[PDB]
Design an enzyme around this catalytic site. Sequence first.
Site, PDB file in Angstrom:
ATOM      1  CD1 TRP A   1      12.249  -1.365 -22.586  1.00  0.00           C
ATOM      2  CD2 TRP A   1      10.752   0.120 -21.857  1.00  0.00           C
ATOM      3  NE1 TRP A   1      12.089  -1.566 -21.239  1.00  0.00           N
ATOM      4  CE2 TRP A   1      11.177  -0.665 -20.765  1.00  0.00           C
ATOM      5  CE3 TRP A   1       9.815   1.133 -21.631  1.00  0.00           C
ATOM      6  CZ2 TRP A   1      10.693  -0.474 -19.470  1.00  0.00           C
ATOM      7  CZ3 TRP A   1       9.335   1.323 -20.332  1.00  0.00           C
ATOM      8  CH2 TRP A   1       9.774   0.519 -19.276  1.00  0.00           C
TER       9      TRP A   1
ATOM     10  CD  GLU B   1       9.858  -0.212 -10.519  1.00  0.00           C
ATOM     11  OE1 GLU B   1      10.802   0.600 -10.401  1.00  0.00           O
ATOM     12  OE2 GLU B   1       9.982  -1.268 -11.170  1.00  0.00           O
TER      13      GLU B   1
ATOM     14  CD  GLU C   1      14.863   0.388 -11.581  1.00  0.00           C
ATOM     15  OE1 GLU C   1      13.622   0.491 -11.380  1.00  0.00           O
ATOM     16  OE2 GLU C   1      15.489  -0.709 -11.663  1.00  0.00           O
TER      17      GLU C   1
ATOM     18  CG  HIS D   1      10.979   0.305 -14.233  1.00  0.00           C
ATOM     19  ND1 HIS D   1      11.943  -0.262 -13.423  1.00  0.00           N
ATOM     20  CD2 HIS D   1      11.380   0.088 -15.510  1.00  0.00           C
ATOM     21  CE1 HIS D   1      12.879  -0.804 -14.180  1.00  0.00           C
ATOM     22  NE2 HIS D   1      12.563  -0.604 -15.449  1.00  0.00           N
TER      23      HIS D   1
ATOM     24  CD  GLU E   1      16.825  -3.999  -9.660  1.00  0.00           C
ATOM     25  OE1 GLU E   1      15.597  -4.201  -9.588  1.00  0.00           O
ATOM     26  OE2 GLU E   1      17.304  -3.056 -10.323  1.00  0.00           O
TER      27      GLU E   1
ATOM     28  CB  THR F   1      11.152  -5.888  -8.597  1.00  0.00           C
ATOM     29  OG1 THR F   1      12.406  -5.917  -9.287  1.00  0.00           O
ATOM     30  CG2 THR F   1      11.316  -5.114  -7.299  1.00  0.00           C
TER      31      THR F   1
ATOM     32  CG  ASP G   1      14.338  -2.053 -17.935  1.00  0.00           C
ATOM     33  OD1 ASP G   1      14.380  -2.573 -19.080  1.00  0.00           O
ATOM     34  OD2 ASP G   1      14.127  -0.831 -17.744  1.00  0.00           O
ATOM     35  CD  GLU G   2      13.388  -4.013 -11.949  1.00  0.00           C
ATOM     36  OE1 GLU G   2      14.622  -3.803 -11.813  1.00  0.00           O
ATOM     37  OE2 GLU G   2      12.514  -3.181 -11.590  1.00  0.00           O
TER      38      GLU G   2
ATOM     39  CG  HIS H   1      18.649  -3.061 -13.492  1.00  0.00           C
ATOM     40  ND1 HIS H   1      17.429  -2.435 -13.338  1.00  0.00           N
ATOM     41  CD2 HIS H   1      19.279  -2.415 -14.503  1.00  0.00           C
ATOM     42  CE1 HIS H   1      17.333  -1.448 -14.212  1.00  0.00           C
ATOM     43  NE2 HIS H   1      18.442  -1.415 -14.929  1.00  0.00           N
TER      44      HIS H   1
HETATM   45 FE   LIG Z   1      12.137  -0.950 -11.250  1.00  0.00          FE
HETATM   46 FE   LIG Z   2      14.757  -2.042 -10.168  1.00  0.00          FE
END
Ligand SMILES: [Fe+3]
Ligand SMILES: [Fe+3]
Lengths: 346, 346
Positions: free
Chosen positions: A45, A88, A126, A129, A179, A182, A211-212, A215
């Site tokens: 995305w 971020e 990242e 974000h 990670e 967040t 995403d987090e 990760h």
């Molecule tokens: Fe982030």
């Molecule tokens: Fe991150």
Amino acid sequence: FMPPREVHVQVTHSMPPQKIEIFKSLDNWAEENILVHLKPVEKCWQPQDFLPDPASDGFDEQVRELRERAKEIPDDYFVVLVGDMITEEALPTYQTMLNTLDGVRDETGASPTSWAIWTRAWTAEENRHGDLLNKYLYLSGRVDMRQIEKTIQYLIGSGMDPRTENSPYLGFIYTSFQERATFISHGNTARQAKEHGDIKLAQICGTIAADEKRHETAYTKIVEKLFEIDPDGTVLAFADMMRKKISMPAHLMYDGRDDNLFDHFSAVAQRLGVYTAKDYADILEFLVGRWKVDKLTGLSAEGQKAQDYVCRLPPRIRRLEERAQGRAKEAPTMPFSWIFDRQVKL
Amino acid sequence: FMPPREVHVQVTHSMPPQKIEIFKSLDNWAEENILVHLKPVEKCWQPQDFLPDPASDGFDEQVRELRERAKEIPDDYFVVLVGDMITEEALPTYQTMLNTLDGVRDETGASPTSWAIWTRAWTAEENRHGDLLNKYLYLSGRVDMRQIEKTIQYLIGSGMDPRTENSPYLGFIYTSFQERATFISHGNTARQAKEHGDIKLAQICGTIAADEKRHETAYTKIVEKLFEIDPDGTVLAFADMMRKKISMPAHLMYDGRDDNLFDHFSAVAQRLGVYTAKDYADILEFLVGRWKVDKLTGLSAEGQKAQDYVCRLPPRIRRLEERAQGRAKEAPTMPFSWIFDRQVKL
Ligand SMILES: [Fe+3]
Ligand SMILES: [Fe+3]
Ligand SMILES: [Fe+3]
Ligand SMILES: [Fe+3]
Ligand SMILES: [Zn+2]
Ligand SMILES: [Zn+2]
């Protein structure tokens, strides 16, 4: 005037020199076990997927809506969201931070090592974000972009010292923890935007959290591999980080106006339940469960001490906060430059 | 599918180990002579100073204007501006790139060294360029933010290898050259936006150029100090960079669609005169004049060779391009994914 500075004395290269190979050799492992957690760029995305479409006949009504919706979101939430976004946005710091880690650092900025490729790719993911949140905040019209922009400049120029001491042991435990931190934050701001009746905002926070989660899986895998290869040293790293406490990546935060900005931001995160001290402890308890620290054999005198301390810490911290929480008094209302000095309850 | 990769073989630490002190000792000099070229954050402009004010009764008409104005700007210009912005957006790469340089690298991300403080602060100032351009491009509605966002992801994950070989000699000559390169670019996109009748766009490009002029002065001062302290080694660095040619920071550029994206972007920069090959040579000629390379005594056999080559190169390159230019044929029209595959003349 003058921003905050790291009060703790600086330490470089706390890791033994020879062991760097343990990370030079794990190059193959990394490709099979960390690089899989990367989305191909074409499948990713992009911030535009979640913002008004400026090349669409609908752009005007889209923006007009985003803004109507925003009014119904209270200032305190905005303060938290803003802090988030500022964190971020200080991304260049975090890529630099991963390029100090002794076992993994990218030697040229384009090094074909599995570790470097992961670093460059994670940074790339990242970067989305910051952008998405930035433009959302910008369009909303509820926050002070200039002051936010200023904070970001103060932050990037301050840097961070996460006290990882160039150790991938400490560093990857840090990132593992961060990670997830967040992730809980974003999921809550998501869940809370849902409640304030803004699903498009929920989606933003939602897909960042995505995403987090990914990760975090990658980093909790790297620690799992270090618990197997070096059960003692990893426990020593995990204990060491817990005693120093995990100093968040955006703590040197300064808007030219609040000498204790980060504390106040964090207080608002707390009251709303975006990221509480419970959550901190809950993350820990999850990591002890995730790495099965509860069950490990072959530990040195210090290692068993390093283990037990870590294992008993979650109910300890929770109960420490418990009684601090049931004795906390009414907090004052304080102005934030991020919101034109309008005031939220701390 | 698969992005481009550095075709040249990777080289690390081309500098002698002992000399790192020459950069460890120059800490005091740096504070007196480089840190002065930094604007205090409170005095700095922020992207919001140059974009519609979302917290203003005028925000709607402001955006509506920005957009009317944009229509009158032709696609080719947009392609160049977009390339620019994509370069500027890949900032996390460039902070990482400065943290590989052997004499200066920030050891912890918050190291109090003059060199680190400069690095963190410069990054902080650069972060503004990406943002401002990004949001301008976004609001304009003339470009494809999704594809641009994708390119940026491909770029950050590709990284760069400017072939500085961790040498601050080569590295600071690189940055010296690059900062002037963008300065000429931005001043031209400024001067050209003026012509297309958009002064607010000119101002954007204008005040970015300002930052670059300052950064360039700082870096051309660091080279000047290296010409005095080590006349031979600096000439050897300056010659070495010229033979390899300066590979621009955004050359691994890829939109998932054009295998030669950077070449095509650069071609459009060329035709319009935002950054020509003349400019490349003109920069060189200026640096020879700036550092007085024409007049230096005490040079080794290779150094005199390294000097003369460098000094005769500007009229050489200019004339090389001259005849290439007066023989260049009509270029094809090519689609760019940054503009929904609309087509500009290469
Ligand atoms: Fe982030
Ligand atoms: Fe991150
Ligand atoms: Fe720039
Ligand atoms: Fe620059
Ligand atoms: Zn950003
Ligand atoms: Zn940016």
